Amino acid sequence: MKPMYRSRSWRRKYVRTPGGRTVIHFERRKPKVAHCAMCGRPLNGVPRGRPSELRKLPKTKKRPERPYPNLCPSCMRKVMKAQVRASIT
Amino acid sequence: GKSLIQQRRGKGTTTFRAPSHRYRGAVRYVPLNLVQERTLRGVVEEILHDPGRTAPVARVKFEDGTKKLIIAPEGVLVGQEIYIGPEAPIAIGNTLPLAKIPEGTYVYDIEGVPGDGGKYVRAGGTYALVVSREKDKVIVQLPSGELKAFNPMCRATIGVVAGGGRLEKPIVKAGKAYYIAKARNRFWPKPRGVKMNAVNHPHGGKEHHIGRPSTVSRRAPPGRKVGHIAARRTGRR
Amino acid sequence: GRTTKVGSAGRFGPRYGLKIRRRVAAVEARMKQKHVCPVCGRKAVRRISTGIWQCQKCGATFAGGAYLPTTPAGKVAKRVTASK
Amino acid sequence: MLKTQRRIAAELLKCGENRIWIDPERIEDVAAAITREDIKRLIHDGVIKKKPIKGQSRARARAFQEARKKGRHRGPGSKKGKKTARMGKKEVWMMTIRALRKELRKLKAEGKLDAHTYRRLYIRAKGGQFKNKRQLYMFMQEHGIL
Amino acid sequence: ARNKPFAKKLRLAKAAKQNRRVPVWVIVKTNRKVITHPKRRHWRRTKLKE
Amino acid sequence: GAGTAPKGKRNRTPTHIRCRRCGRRAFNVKKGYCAACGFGRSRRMRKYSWSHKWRKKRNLSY
RNA sequence: CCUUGUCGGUUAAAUGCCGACCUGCAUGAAUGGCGUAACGAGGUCCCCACUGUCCCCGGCUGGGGCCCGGCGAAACCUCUGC
RNA sequence: GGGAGUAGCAGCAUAGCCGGGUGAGAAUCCCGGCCGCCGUAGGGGCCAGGGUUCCACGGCAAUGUUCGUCAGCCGUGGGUUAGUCGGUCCUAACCCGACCCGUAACUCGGCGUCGGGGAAAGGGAAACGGGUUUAUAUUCCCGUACCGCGGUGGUAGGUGCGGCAACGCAAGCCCGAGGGGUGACGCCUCGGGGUAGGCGGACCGGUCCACAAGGCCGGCUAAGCGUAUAAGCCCGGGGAGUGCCGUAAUGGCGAGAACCGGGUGAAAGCGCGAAUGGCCUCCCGUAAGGGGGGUUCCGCCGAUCCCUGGGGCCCGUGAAAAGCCCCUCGGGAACGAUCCACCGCGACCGUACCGAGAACCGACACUGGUGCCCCUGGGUGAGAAGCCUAAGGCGUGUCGGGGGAAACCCAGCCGAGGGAACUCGGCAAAUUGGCCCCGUAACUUCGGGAGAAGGGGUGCCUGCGGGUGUGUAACCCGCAGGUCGCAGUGACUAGGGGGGCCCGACUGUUUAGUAAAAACACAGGUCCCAGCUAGCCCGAAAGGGUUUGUACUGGGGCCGACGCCUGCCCAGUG
RNA sequence: GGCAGGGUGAAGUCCCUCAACAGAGGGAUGGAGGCCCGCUAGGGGUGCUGGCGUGCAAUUCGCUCCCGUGACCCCGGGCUAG
Ligand SMILES: [Zn+2]
Ligand SMILES: [Zn+2]
Ligand SMILES: [Zn+2]
Ligand SMILES: [Zn+2]
């Protein structure tokens, strides 16, 4: 094993070959899930992936179709209600 | 002879230097330039532990989105509104000039000359007391028992510093003391000079004893000021 | 609670002496219990760090003492500043 | 010399060099073989072979296991580790309490327990006075639950 | 595999080309007066300066 | 102790490498200067009167 | 210091160890005084068990030493040598 | 020159014998067989360092502790192929330059501003399997893919929908600004879901075994593309306290539980890739080469490998930036993609081999060090222990041959009777030893002492019961009976105990190479200076350390856990 | 970047029974510690005053002994100079 693979940021895997060799494969680690700005809750409808995995996806498969996708539904309803209540006069 | 530890500290080496790169930023007031008489308003976002402050800090978002750090007062919540300026109200966490703070009020983070940013009563658990007000000066009792006069335009914050009572629980272990002193790289462990050799200390020698008074004049040169420096008295009472 | 005299200081056995063990046990037994929230009024407040306290139900987060959420000087400052 | 043929044949046949065989009546033909073509030809013919692996049977161990399953070789003279090491401490409790809770839910679904009794039995089992399902059932019988 | 700077590689190549004995026709042409040169070197006795 | 065994820890990175201006192995790799010619520390050459190196290189009398 | 101080206990037999007595040449209170459970490859005395430590030494194993073939130095050296 | 044809070529891994061959010549080189050693390293992979030691052919003047036909030696010729592996890019601690101040001056010293460097194990676009060479291969060839940039033609869209909702969708182009997330993080402990690897049974071929019974070998499937649940978190309905619901455990609920449905969401597995590819075996002339077959199922254990969730600790809080995704806003044109298909292009350097009881450092082919840095089948067994063994490697920890061939030395085994009479001193050696049950003192900081002490038992065979589990699957816990030996943790593994005194409270550190301690440190006690342009310190100055700091703080002394205590003297020196 | 395996069992969280003016007993869960055993790896260097002492070695070898989740061990990049 090279020193760059002796790093533990590579999550090795043991894999058997058609010719029967049992080589070792290395991969990089997956980033964590998106979180809400204020509440800190995990967001739904947003998948985990590295830039490689996320750039082979269209836009509408990377966030929900509703306003303020950076927030959770509770926070979104709050900000909408506040906007509409400020927009009375 | 050979040098002392306090002489080696002056040269400024890694063995004696503070690891400020580990710390949250510096804590200063907004300048008077922007606060001629504007009386800005802010909201607390988060409260944070600082490794170089002996007290917790709080992050505050202001008028223009600017985020500043403050020394946190005891009782402050996340989501509070704090005010800075002359017409601010009298409430824990608000900053006012000493000319608008009545006698008998508890205060912290006071400026020496206006615009400084905060110098006195910053430490965890401390507070100062306003004693008298006048046209030439305001007078304040400090946590050392000293009464000091400030210009009445010097700014200060109302309340008490958070984080008091650290010293009611003992440190129990050399290892805990190691970690505490490594956080801020204080010289630890400490040697005794009466157990050094003569080249190393004014004390020192095979027979382990100070052979002359420990009290040393204020006018003695560096390399010699060890023991009780310019002591008015000694002993218990 | 198997012990008669010792508490949280049973972790390090016959070491470090009686006065010190007693003090540590007392402070920790006062700290680790739950406390009343200044917002919702329920006994759900725990310590997060040195000087930072948090309620588990409502999510209130405030700054306080090192080992107890309040201090005597804080109490007196609250009273004096409320009056005047 | 013949080291070249040995290593090349070991690479081609996916084995160790100490497992290759060269016929001693043909060392001249094997020395005349310098190319991998020649070496593959000689392998095809049968001048260079790969011996089989040697084995190490397990048939004594099979018999020991069968006898132990029927009850031999497990007396106070064969144990070297502690009892808590041979059977766990927390694992026993895990399996016990999981069995108990499974059985209680099964009974409550079949209709022989109401919520009050289910709850009191749940609390008893958490407190840890049963230690097996037969003891649970005996307690239920000697009280008036069934 | 094993990482080298390029100028270093070139200096090593030169040091390798340098290490051989005097040809035979030079000895013939000099009548056995030139037989060696001062840059013979074995990899396990005298080290280079890297 | 202090002799034969510590000599085994000379497989780290070298203290000096070859200099581009001087030619020889005296360039301090961590400080960024040469100990023989001054490259990286001075435009001018290192040249002391108590030294014999440059005189030897030019076959000069001391 | 005189000193193997005197008394008692431990031995068949005690310049030892433990306990006391004060005549402290020249003890003594944060150059800390007196105690102390737990801990120590620290120093010291005794008991049980155990033994080639010893009475008193004996037999066996392997590697050297000895012989044969091969390679082949050094310290040191006035000349010599009852 | 004498020493001397002498010492050394032993000790830590005691290894060779038989047959055949080559060659002038063989204890020492090659082939086969027998016998051996290592086996959580003497095996496999690969940094730094070395630099051609790599490969083939041909040699034996010197080298190799002996010989040598051998060789890391000598000579002659050869050998390292990348859009995807690494460097280049970002920043960390930190450094440099210009200006600026100081210096008699500088190649010297320094704050701040601007700019630039700084990681081949930190962050960070993109490839897998098979074959090919004397020596290279994720680099060459075959097959099957991917990334960026730039284009060609169409399409969604501009000018569109389904769902109460959570959400599901191909869901417009070009410049700039702002915001959010990600990148992005400590230590300890536990659960769940999987995988590598292993074990058992059946079947198919081959092989070993006096028959039989039986044993051993093989029975394969990469990236990529397409497909879902678990946990956790959410959306609707629902409407609860003598309470219900749940976990390995902590727990949850009118600030909205049970219960009923749904959404989102990992590692994996499944399918295509892909079966005249790889492995095994069977038949005739043997030079190319011919033909045929098999590639099946069930059941267990299971990681220190992968994913996912909880809990506990801090007077201690465990990086940043580039890059990438999304939303909003402003300004433009009327066209036009983050979707489908096709084409083109992709620079520079590294790439051989060792990686250590012979390729590194130590003057050596040195029992040392660097590197144990990453990884390892079966049995017994708590076990990565010791012992035996498979794979793989070696017989090069590079001098051999003789022997009743002594004395003496080094490393080991046994010794009648006595049992420390030895010696400064029980030095050394011996005794005990694993597991289950019984039983356990003084003293104590009530935590300990404590495995105190001391005592009894243990093998093999024939059966009977229990626990979890669907299990005549697997892993564990007890009982009775019969029988053999001097001896049943039979080898390997594996504590001698107790009672007093001095010192030091404890864990820790120390005179590299004659001192490991009663010496140092330690928590803790007490004293001193200082309100910041301070106190203490560096410097020739400019400036600077403590300071991204402010008396619960910074600096300076002495004593030294804990318990009871700490008396008199201010004439002298300060 | 690393540290096999095993033991003891602090806080925290509870259960059962008789009861009852009081109380008295008995069972679990949980996994802390500058804790314990341990030639796991790794680190150190007590005694034999052993071998060697022109050595394998200008500080090594063997047996015995000590620490081994922490004030621990080690690596790459940096700083302090008579
Ligand atoms: Zn939210
Ligand atoms: Zn929310
Ligand atoms: Zn609350
Ligand atoms: Zn130079």
Curated annotation (Swiss-Prot), chain A:
Gene Ontology biological process terms from the UniProt entry: translation
Region (Disordered): 41-72
Molecular functions per Gene Ontology: metal ion binding; structural constituent of ribosome
Binding site for Zn(2+): 36, 39, 72, 75
A Pfam family the protein falls into: Ribosomal_L34e
A Gene Ontology term for the protein's cellular component: ribosome
Highest rank taxon of the organism: Archaea
InterPro entries: Ribosomal_eL34, Ribosomal_eL34_C_sf, Ribosomal_eL34_CS, Ribosomal_L34e_arc-type
Acetylation listed as a keyword: no
Residues making up the signal peptide according to the UniProt record: none
Gene3D superfamilies found in the cross-reference section: 6.20.340.10
Note accompanying the cofactor annotation: Binds 1 Zn(2+) per subunit.
Record keyword Ribosomal protein present: yes
HAMAP family: Ribosomal_eL34 (MF_00349)
Family of this protein: Belongs to the eukaryotic ribosomal protein eL34 family.
Protein name according to UniProt: Large ribosomal subunit protein eL34
Species this protein is from: Thermococcus kodakarensis (strain ATCC BAA-918 / JCM 12380 / KOD1) (Pyrococcus kodakaraensis (strain KOD1))
Encoding gene per record: rpl34e
UniProtKB/Swiss-Prot annotation, chain D:
InterPro entries: 60S_ribosomal_eL19_sf (IPR035970), Ribosomal_eL19 (IPR039547), Ribosomal_eL19_CS (IPR023638), Ribosomal_eL19_dom (IPR000196), Ribosomal_eL19_dom1 (IPR015972)
Keyword presence, Glycoprotein: no
Keywords: Ribonucleoprotein, Ribosomal protein, RNA-binding, rRNA-binding
GO CC field: cytosolic large ribosomal subunit
Disordered: annotated segments: 54-87
A GO term, aspect molecular function: large ribosomal subunit rRNA binding
Keyword Ribosomal protein: yes
Biological process, per Gene Ontology: translation
SMART domains on file: Ribosomal_L19e (SM01416)
NCBIfam families: PRK08570.1
Family: Belongs to the eukaryotic ribosomal protein eL19 family.
Quaternary structure and interacting proteins, as annotated: Part of the 50S ribosomal subunit.
Free-text function comment from the UniProt entry: Binds to the 23S rRNA.
Name of the protein: Large ribosomal subunit protein eL19
Organism from which the protein derives: Thermococcus kodakarensis (strain ATCC BAA-918 / JCM 12380 / KOD1) (Pyrococcus kodakaraensis (strain KOD1))
UniProtKB/Swiss-Prot annotation, chain E:
A Pfam family recorded for this sequence: Ribosomal_L39
Domain of life: Archaea
Cellular component aspect of the GO annotation: cytosolic large ribosomal subunit
Biological processes per GO annotation: translation
InterPro entries from the UniProt entry: Ribosomal_eL39, Ribosomal_eL39_CS, Ribosomal_eL39_dom_sf
A GO term, aspect molecular function: structural constituent of ribosome
Record keywords: Ribonucleoprotein, Ribosomal protein
Family the entry assigns: Belongs to the eukaryotic ribosomal protein eL39 family.
HAMAP family, sorted: Ribosomal_eL39
Name of the protein: Large ribosomal subunit protein eL39
Native species: Thermococcus kodakarensis (strain ATCC BAA-918 / JCM 12380 / KOD1) (Pyrococcus kodakaraensis (strain KOD1))
Gene: rpl39e
Swiss-Prot record, chain F:
Lineage: Archaea, Methanobacteriati, Methanobacteriota, Thermococci, Thermococcales
Function per UniProt: Binds to the 23S rRNA.
ZnF segments: C4-type: 19-37
SUPFAM superfamilies: Zn-binding ribosomal proteins
Protein's name according to its UniProt entry: Large ribosomal subunit protein eL37
Family, per entry: Belongs to the eukaryotic ribosomal protein eL37 family.
Any single biological process term in GO: translation
Names of required cofactors: Zn(2+)
PROSITE patterns reported for this sequence: RIBOSOMAL_L37E (PS01077)
Cellular component terms per the entry's GO annotation: cytosolic large ribosomal subunit
Record organism: Thermococcus kodakarensis (strain ATCC BAA-918 / JCM 12380 / KOD1) (Pyrococcus kodakaraensis (strain KOD1))
Domain of life (superkingdom): Archaea
Keyword Zinc attributed: yes
Statement: the UniProt record of this protein carries the keyword Zinc-finger: yes
Keywords, alphabetical: Metal-binding, Ribonucleoprotein, Ribosomal protein, RNA-binding, rRNA-binding, Zinc, Zinc-finger
Positions of transmembrane segments: none
Binding residue positions for Zn(2+): 19, 22, 34, 37
Subunit (UniProt): Part of the 50S ribosomal subunit.
Cofactor binding note of this UniProt entry: Binds 1 zinc ion per subunit.
Gene name of the record: rpl37e
